[PDB]
Symmetry: D2
């Protein structure tokens, strides 16, 4: 069952350029509205020496507003839940691999997240912390070999005006057999609404809505 | 830029080293973001590859831009603009294309070059197993004083599933224009009729610019 | 600081498609001959559900024969040691990210390794365990922004015949300031010499030699 | 075939939309893996891009093959072979090229097409900041009954550092020939002389096949 008001609990363990860190979060969202927010706390490896923005899209497509005409792969997967894997290939060769194992306990989603980024150059916008925010995005979702894929090419706006491109490849895997959707889209907008100076505390929001594009 | 505009084009190209040429005439409504055209294979027919790889090469002036997004393309006329594009398919087939667009009265004139390589003999392009392009959402952003366009899209396949392609486009106005912020263009391109070997093709496209997840005030 | 005969001790912690595992190894090698061998034992997450081959090039370029005329970035970095990071981008979309922090204790190199692979399709050669061996390879090494890079586009041989390609991007980072080499190459040949049925025990060998390619 | 062979080619192409044409004549020793040629720009000069992006497009028959490795290329004659290639530079510039190689007496005849797109205005190609290709080691392997070649190589830059490029080549014999095992070809290509705007270029290449890490002193 998925209620109008759900909660979120997560732990991320990870590393960037070989340097370990760990983050925990608690939050709330409205799955039928495609909106969520959460408060994140760095527990290990702080102060983080890399742009926090590379982490935020790893911190659940159940928080997406799906219209009746499009099959909802994610709300179907519960109570058993689903997992996802993702590669995030930035244009300067930095690459982040991430996984999230999502379970449900009562009215609370539980995330077990792993995050590993390598080859971020010392003078690039990530290690120099010169990212501003992710732009809004439109993810493309499609079935391949019985599971759901999501591809998007998006970008971070940089301090000073420019953009830093990143290519997302996600595989979504329900833990139980669910009915699969047709090719469709998910519009996203993720935003850090508040943070302290070294990002030990972050309030993170996301809004997402599925659609089928131009008719 | 009038409410009703005409299109005239010629494409010269090659796929896997085998040359061909296509000419087209069409019409469209630039402010409604809609256009259609009839295309004729002039050389190299019958084409031995999936026609679909050509269709997104057969003009973002035909995109409905809201007042609230700066229109790079309508600004560039009468002088016009040019674009370059690489289309990177997931099985390694790669197509490079260019279009130099000028304006003659109410008619846009395209001079197009198209070169595709490394399409495997047993793949969906050389075996014409494509059905259509899905609708897409392109991302547009400024780099080095010109406009770029990236989109990861896909062709639907004859037996199910999809065949992915990554587009990288560079748009270059021929005169100085005002650059627009990061935005999107939704597309849907469709073959609306064709004869058996695709020597004749009726092609339509609909495109609308927008700024992503924000209208519903009723 | 670099003896003709050196030993190896390592622990790898990692995950493939979200399923964690851990492996430890002990070995020995001859840095000036560019040869090494090691025994690896599955400690957690066995029996491994993926092709063991994707791990082996993560199980140290100090074990490469460098001529006098090519600066040896790796033997220079000791006793302080060096670290490396790597992406391994397979042609079907599977991606493995790995890091190795290498230290030296007496005559023993100590590796702390992390390995994370995602998006390997269920019907692909990795999850179906259809790999035979890595082919011999030639890595290209060059300086960028004060550190050393290594790129190579190798392949794994498959059972029914054919090859499964992988693009390697490695960054090597000495822990101290060392002299930087010119553009050069390292030939590799890595081989699993013995293993038990589910690869809980693996004997792994590699041979490597640096060179500067066809002369000018 | 012969220990001494001649070469005559013509390349037609475009970079970032702008068209050009080059012709060349040369000679080489296929069993020694060495060749040289003189190239002349016939159209589109002075070339506004780094000449180096063209040179590896200007024939693996000029590679020294040991007896233990099957020679796909020397087998394909007199009928010849063709190849297609995509050259993917690290800043997004991409070049697609094809070469149809035939044999006329003792002269190889190349018909070459070259199309590069998305080279940024401030990058090393459009600013002519390349020095030379480094030596390389190509990996060759059979796929789909034809021969493939992959190599990740680099151009050295005029201010230091390197500019990377990933080559993907498909080699297609025109007749049925014997297929080789996975192997390598070492390359070293060099511009030995040129005039100021590269309308005239003397180009050399040396190439040798081998099987990777294998001097018994005799």
């Amino acid at each position: 069952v998925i209620k109008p008001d759900m909660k979120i609990k997560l732990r991320m363990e990870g590393a960037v350029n070989g340097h370990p860190f760990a983050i925990e979060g608690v939050g709330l969202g409205k799955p039928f509205e495609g909106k969520q927010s959460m408060d994140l706390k760095v527990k290990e490896g702080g102060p983080l020496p890399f742009a926090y923005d590379i982490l935020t899209t790893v911190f659940n497509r159940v928080f997406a507003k799906y219209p009746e005409n499009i099959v909802d792969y994610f709300k179907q997967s519960f109570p058993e839940g689903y997992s996802w894997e993702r590669s995030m290939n930035y244009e300067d060769g930095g690459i982040c691999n991430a996984t999230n194992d999502i379970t449900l306990d009562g009215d609370c989603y539980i995330y077990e997240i792993r995050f590993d980024g390598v080859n971020f150059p010392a003078n690039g916008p990530v290690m120099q912390k010169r990212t501003v925010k992710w732009e809004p995005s439109t993810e493309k979702l499609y079935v391949r070999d019985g599971v759901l894929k999501g591809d998007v090419n998006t970008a971070l706006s940089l301090e000073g005006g420019g953009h830093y491109r990143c290519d997302f490849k996600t595989t979504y895997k329900a833990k139980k057999v669910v009915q699969l959707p047709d090719y469709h889209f998910v519009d996203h907008h993720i935003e850090i609404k508040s943070h302290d100076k070294d990002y030990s505390n972050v309030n993170l929001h996301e809004h997402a809505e599925a659609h089928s594009g131009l008719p």
